[PDB]
Design a protein around this ligand. Structure first.
Ligand SMILES: [Mg+2]
Ligand SMILES: [Mg+2]
Ligand SMILES: [Mg+2]
Ligand SMILES: [Mg+2]
Ligand SMILES: [Mg+2]
Ligand SMILES: [Mg+2]
Ligand SMILES: [Mg+2]
Ligand SMILES: [Mg+2]
Ligand SMILES: [Mg+2]
Ligand SMILES: [Mg+2]
Ligand SMILES: [Mg+2]
Ligand SMILES: [Mg+2]
Length: 181
RNA sequence: GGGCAGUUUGACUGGGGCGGUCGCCUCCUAAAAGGUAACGGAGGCGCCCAAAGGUCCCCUCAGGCGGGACGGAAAUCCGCCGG
């Protein structure tokens, strides 16, 4: 389904707002979202491979995309890990399904958070990408109450043709991100 | 069944005994071919794998810095440098 608000938001709204703000010279040099990665630090489900399926299928309806995993390379002896075996969920979303995830983020995910305050502005990686943490993934639409067996956490990532955080800062505000000033 | 009989009871070894060692692999000693000794200096082997093998295809690390709900000295993830 190639169409949505954020599909056009970036275009008939953000496209020229940037050309004014920074003034490019070519249609491509303009900062674009193009890669949303979603991650999970599930060292917890080290034991239960069952709870592995839940964070995965939940991820399915929230990310609107099939989920994937990744076991470690040199695993922490101390915290119950050793070699190739463990677990760390990961699911890169691109094209349009990326958008349809984002629309749920700044218009549903954020507005109903336990005392959400604003996306920490320091979260820019010096270059043009963003990373931010969430505790409850039940703030997502499809997730019902009597269904979650535990508060599994995770953290999202969004890659941008941005070359500096200023340029990224502007490009996320313009698409619609509730920054903590 | 030492009453009795025949015998056995290793070598190296700055004397012999005691100690240590005894075959195989790696490095040094070794003097830029090879090979070289010492009771010279140091470490391993007496296995393991049906996937840890064949071939086809695909991808490429460790680490350093920056960023990320548990966790950051080191899980998993995005980025950039990284032969
Ligand atoms: Mg030119
Ligand atoms: Mg005789
Ligand atoms: Mg003798
Ligand atoms: Mg002697
Ligand atoms: Mg002896
Ligand atoms: Mg030599
Ligand atoms: Mg020689
Ligand atoms: Mg010869
Ligand atoms: Mg000779
Ligand atoms: Mg394997
Ligand atoms: Mg293997
Ligand atoms: Mg760090």
């Amino acid at each position: 389904p190639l169409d949505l608000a954020l599909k056009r938001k970036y275009y008939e709204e953000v496209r020229p707002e940037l050309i004014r703000r920074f003034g490019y010279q070519n249609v491509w040099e303009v900062p674009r979202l193009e890669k949303v990665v979603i991650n999970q630090g599930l060292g917890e489900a080290k034991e239960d491979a069952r709870i592995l399926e839940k964070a995965a299928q939940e991820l399915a309806l929230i990310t609107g995309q099939k989920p994937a995993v990744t076991r470690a390379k040199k695993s922490i002896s101390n915290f119950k890990l050793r070699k190739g075996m463990p677990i760390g969920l990961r699911v890169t979303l691109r094209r349009d399904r990326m958008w349809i995830f984002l629309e749920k983020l700044l218009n549903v995910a954020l507005p109903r958070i336990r005392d959400f305050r604003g996306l920490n502005p320091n979260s820019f990686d010096g270059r043009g990408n963003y990373n931010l943490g969430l505790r409850e993934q039940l703030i997502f639409p499809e997730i019902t109450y009597d269904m979650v067996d535990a508060l599994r956490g995770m953290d999202i990532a969004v890659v941008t043709t941005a070359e500096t955080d200023e340029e990224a800062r502007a490009l996320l505000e313009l698409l619609g991100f509730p920054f903590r000033k």
